[PDB]
Amino acid sequence: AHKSEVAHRFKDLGEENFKALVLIAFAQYLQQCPFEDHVKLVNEVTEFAKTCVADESAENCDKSLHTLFGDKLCTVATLRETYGEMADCCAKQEPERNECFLQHKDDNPNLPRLVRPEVDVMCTAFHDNEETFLKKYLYEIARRHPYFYAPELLFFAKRYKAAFTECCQAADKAACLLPKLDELRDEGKASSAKQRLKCASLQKFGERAFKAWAVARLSQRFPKAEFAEVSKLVTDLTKVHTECCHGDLLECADDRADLAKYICENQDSISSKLKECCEKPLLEKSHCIAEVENDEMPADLPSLAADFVESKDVCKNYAEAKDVFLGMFLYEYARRHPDYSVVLLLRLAKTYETTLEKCCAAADPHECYAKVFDEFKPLVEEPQNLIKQNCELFEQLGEYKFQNALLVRYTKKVPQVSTPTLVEVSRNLGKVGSKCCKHPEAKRMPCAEDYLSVVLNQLCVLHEKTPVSDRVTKCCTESLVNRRPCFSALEVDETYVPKEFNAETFTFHADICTLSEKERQIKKQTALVELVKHKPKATKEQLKAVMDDFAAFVEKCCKADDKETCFAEEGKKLVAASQAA
Ligand SMILES: COc1cc([C@@H]2c3cc4c(cc3[C@@H](O[C@@H]3O[C@@H]5CO[C@@H](c6cccs6)O[C@H]5[C@H](O)[C@H]3O)[C@H]3COC(=O)[C@H]23)OCO4)cc(OC)c1O
């Protein structure tokens, strides 16, 4: 190996990348420490890295990256008064002292809300001091998203710096800042959600589940590449995502850069869509590789019948190698079905292996798998019909009405869940159809099923901290690929005792008449959640009508005077109406 691995990482990543990655790692481990302490720690670490790269014979950096980072970290966090039950695990040492910070990551911290100052003062402070401003941006974005993907974060910071340096020195200021930065924040939220999905899969269902997922995704993405190249790529990026998800940020970025270099070195052996990615810089190179379009469908592809169902030695070949055989099957199937969802391909592979384990090593083997591909017809027909009906229900209802419909549906399904997480999950579930119902019936399903799984994993992780619904936990821990089939097959919870009537939850105030559109919509959806929880047995049309009445008075008397009079009168009237249904 390479002695003084901190020096090796510093040499490979560079100076500024090393500093930014160390800042990201520190901010993700400590989500409550102030920015100045993180800057001081990062500066000390990078001076140590400079000293050790200057002379490898240093007597201190013979230690590993994890113990070095912990030593520089938990001495500041050695006080168990401000961070709560956080300094306890600094007492122990490697390797449990890494779990110290791994298990203490807070997905939903109660950090103070951002103010978002005006554009002019914002980028004049940017011009006043850029490095501190960008470090503050990285620290703030890493605080609220402890499971962010670090090289993606570096790319986002680079794009943010480029936007600031490019489009506020011009004539107008906000015209470029607001829409561009809104697009970047939406991209950041989406990337954080995807990386949280990957990290949760790796940390819960094992490395094999993520390896199978990545094999399916890459085979769907690189149909031309042979199985050896796909296996090498999935091993490399599985190591990468394990390293980021385990807190090994520096080596994770290093390995992602190496993977991008390999991929654009061997494009011709992998895919033809990569010819336009690595001409970009390293960060943009990796981003393009991670988001490259699917390659063209190869011709003369067999139907999988002669090799996987008709072959008489299929169960034997499974017997010698189970993991390799299932990887080959999943790779071939994902090659032949790019329109199929990745988790759908995982479900199909699981069904195939369950059938093979069930019978081929019992009685006549051939008298099962000759018809095993007939078992996949309902497995693919269910998601197609589900997303078809969801997109149809979305097309004439629109954004907000679709949000309301999904919200009342999921509140009926699992009323025990807390209101804010339920509202957020419903909002994202409406954004599903908002983003990929416009595609034809050849690319709707990837968006649909994949980002449905992303949002459902967000629900599962938000529910893990305060487990209150038995079914939600039961089928969030059950399987990673069957989350959406569970949350679709769940029926109305009969055992749920209706929530006690509280008039406060159905009464609005002056603030909603002057909030933004998003905040007013969220408050209205929260009121809908409370109403459905109060009367879970009501029908869909009744809730639709009462929500129509809610919007009716909200847009009736938010523009007139005597606000309190309207609030009181309308609240009492609609409370009486809802009580009388
Ligand atoms: C654009 O990138 C993203 C930003 C964000 C949010 C976010 C959301 C915004 C915004 C700015 C910011 C940023 O805050 C900016 O960063 C500066 C950080 O440094 C401080 C200062 C340093 C020295 C003086 S001020 O000022 C800050 C700026 O005001 C602010 O625009 C990020 C800082 O960390 C975050 O979480 C923040 O204006 C409109 O809505 C979320 C993203 O996805 C989840 C994302 O992709």
Swiss-Prot record:
N6-succinyllysine modification sites are 204, 435, 518, 563
- GO terms assigned for molecular function: antioxidant activity; copper ion binding; DNA binding; enterobactin binding; exogenous protein binding; fatty acid binding; identical protein binding; protein-folding chaperone binding
In this chain, where does the modification N6-methyllysine occur? Answer: 533
Q: Which UniProt keywords apply?
A: Calcium, Cleavage on pair of basic residues, Copper, Disease variant, Disulfide bond, Glycation, Glycoprotein, Lipid-binding, Metal-binding, Methylation, Phosphoprotein, Repeat, Secreted, Signal, Zinc
Record: residues binding Ca(2+) 1: 5, 243, 248, 251
The observed outcome of changing residue 312 to N is:
In Canterbury/New Guinea/Tagliacozzo/Cuneo/Cooperstown
- Glyco sites are at 11, 50, 136, 161, 198, 224, 232, 275, 280, 312, 316-317, 322, 350, 377, 412, 438, 443, 493, 524, 533, 535, 544, 572
Post-translational modification as stated in the protein's UniProt record = Glycated in diabetic patients. Phosphorylated by FAM20C in the extracellular medium.
Query: In UniProt terms, what is the effect of altering residue 374 to N?
Result: In Nagasaki-2
Q: Which residues carry this modification: Phosphothreonine?
A: 82, 419, 421
Q: Which residues carry this modification: Phosphoserine?
A: 4, 57, 64, 272, 418, 488
Q: Which GO terms describe its cellular component?
A: blood microparticle; cytoplasm; endoplasmic reticulum; endoplasmic reticulum lumen; extracellular exosome; extracellular region; extracellular space; Golgi apparatus
Which cysteine residues pair off into disulfide bonds? 52-61, 74-90, 89-100, 123-168, 167-176, 199-245, 244-252, 264-278, 277-288, 315-360, 359-368, 391-437, 436-447, 460-476, 475-486, 513-558, 557-566
UniProt lists the family membership as follows: Belongs to the ALB/AFP/VDB family.
Question: What is this protein's function per UniProt?
Answer: Binds water, Ca(2+), Na(+), K(+), fatty acids, hormones, bilirubin and drugs. Its main function is the regulation of the colloidal osmotic pressure of blood. Major zinc transporter in plasma, typically binds about 80% of all plasma zinc. Major calcium and magnesium transporter in plasma, binds approximately 45% of circulating calcium and magnesium in plasma. Potentially has more than two calcium-binding sites and might additionally bind calcium in a non-specific manner.
* Protein name, as recorded: Albumin
